[PDB]
Design a protein around this motif. Structure first.
Motif: not given
Ligand SMILES: NC(=O)c1ccc[n+]([C@@H]2O[C@H](COP(=O)([O-])OP(=O)(O)OC[C@H]3O[C@@H](n4cnc5c(N)ncnc54)[C@H](OP(=O)(O)O)[C@@H]3O)[C@@H](O)[C@H]2O)c1
Ligand SMILES: NC(=O)c1ccc[n+]([C@@H]2O[C@H](COP(=O)([O-])OP(=O)(O)OC[C@H]3O[C@@H](n4cnc5c(N)ncnc54)[C@H](OP(=O)(O)O)[C@@H]3O)[C@@H](O)[C@H]2O)c1
Ligand SMILES: Cc1nc(-c2ccc(OCC(C)C)c(C#N)c2)sc1C(=O)O
Ligand SMILES: Cc1nc(-c2ccc(OCC(C)C)c(C#N)c2)sc1C(=O)O
Lengths: 207, 206
Positions: A57, A84-86, A90, A119, A127, A131, A134-135
């Protein structure tokens, strides 16, 4: 005589990363790893050629890892954490920017076979991570780099075989790949252009 | 009633570019507010009017909203990962300008996170989501005719015109193509049925 010889591995301390690193060192690669400060490689295991301590990051840390490489392997993930995470998407944005700035074109990056699923059939508990895969895939696909999208099914602890099926642009005939075979395939993708721009689903029947 | 002149905010973004192209092809007289006109495409469908300026500058927003029949909002702040108020402050300027010029119709994109539990939001997307919520409240409290468009993941699949629109809740799919999302923003200009509702466009591509 190695056309690809210097590689960066992101996620080398992870389940698939550790065996990918081991196989890459055995095969003669000069491996650079990015490791988080609290999570270094095990002392008894194979040693890479170069270690950057930092975080995917931080653009500055990714830049230091990508500079001077022939190719990049991406095995980022969140271990057992399904929140949930990015971090993967990122991290991929930073990897893309560093590869463009440093003249590296080849990126072999692991997401998951759920990107080839209907999906609405993805298990809800997975999920949030899906997600972000997918990003991440969208970041890498839109980059214009030579991107091999590796989309495996369940990752198991079965042997290295080198005998797995590679299905192009669709789901394959088995629902598992061993972590050793998955790492073997990530390295195989460095030696050929045939999967560039495609999605690949490695799978095997262990018997 | 009949919408011919629209302002688009965020026209240089991923969804903005295709919404702009589709609007020009369909016959709308489009005004865009852009910070840098070189970010508009040199070829193909071009907008009728270009205002160079910043959504944070009330005078620039006023110049963009003057004379329009409706406003499309596709603002975003992709890089912001900590508290940010660009979109909500932009929306306040847009509301003031619409009121001052008698423009009654606004179709604005936030995100489907506003239809889910807050714990679904990745930590690094919380600041943008918080400002989407602020923007949504600004528009809901304005009294203007407001269609809240709350898309899930925005993909790159080709335009279909065949997506589903779910009212005041979520639908089964969790992707909408940027082209279909733009198509839907324009469809909202042709009807009053979505006014005062939240809308979730989604589709199955393969
Ligand atoms: N398990 C399955 O059956 C399955 C199936 C299909 C796809 N997948 C996906 O395949 C991919 C690989 O899975 P895996 O099990 O091999 O991975 P993993 O064991 O979850 O390892 C994740 C790696 O990413 C590193 N990482 C995470 N955050 C980082 C950050 N901020 N900066 C730098 N490095 C970071 C981790 O470092 P630390 O050591 O510091 O944690 C670790 O090396 C994952 O994306 C996973 O979702 C899994
Ligand atoms: N999957 C997704 O990505 C996703 C999903 C759901 C919702 N959303 C939300 O949907 C909305 C549209 O997303 P997008 O990806 O299409 O947007 P984007 O590609 O990030 O573009 C954002 C637009 O807003 C403009 N902008 C930003 N700050 C501005 C300012 N101070 N003054 C004037 N214009 C400004 C930008 O102009 P410049 O070109 O000058 O930068 C750009 O045209 C966003 O709010 C996003 O958070 C995204
Ligand atoms: C049989 C089968 N298992 C799959 C699978 C299983 C676990 C996963 O993640 C586990 C979590 C701890 C990251 C992920 C992902 N991502 C994908 S996919 C698949 C198929 O058939 O395509
Ligand atoms: C699947 C899914 N993706 C969503 C999403 C994805 C990216 C986003 O921001 C992009 C960032 C670069 C600013 C935002 C916002 N804001 C929302 S919402 C959603 C859902 O289903 O609710």
């Amino acid at each position: 005589h190695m056309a690809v010889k210097k590689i960066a591995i992101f996620g080398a301390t992870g389940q698939t990363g550790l065996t990918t690193l081991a196989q890459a060192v055995q095969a003669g690669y000069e491996v650079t790893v990015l490791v988080r400060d609290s999570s270094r490689l095990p002392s008894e295991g194979p040693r890479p050629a170069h270690v950057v301590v930092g975080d995917v990051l931080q653009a500055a840390d990714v830049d230091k890892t990508v500079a001077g490489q022939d190719a990049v392997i991406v095995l980022l993930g969140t271990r057992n954490d399904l929140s949930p995470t990015t971090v993967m998407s990122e991290g991929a944005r930073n990897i893309v920017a560093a590869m463009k700035a440093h003249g590296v074109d080849k990126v072999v990056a692991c997401t998951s076979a759920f990107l080839l699923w209907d999906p609405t059939k993805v298990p809800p508990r997975l999920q949030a991570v899906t997600d972000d895969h997918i990003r991440m895939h969208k970041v890498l696909r839109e980059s214009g780099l030579k991107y091999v999208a590796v989309m495996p099914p369940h990752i198991g602890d079965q042997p290295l075989t080198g005998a797995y099926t590679v299905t192009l642009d669709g789901r394959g005939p088995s629902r598992v790949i061993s972590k050793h075979d998955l790492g073997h395939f990530m390295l195989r993708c460095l030696t050929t252009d045939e999967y560039d721009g495609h999605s690949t689903y490695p799978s095997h029947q262990y018997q």
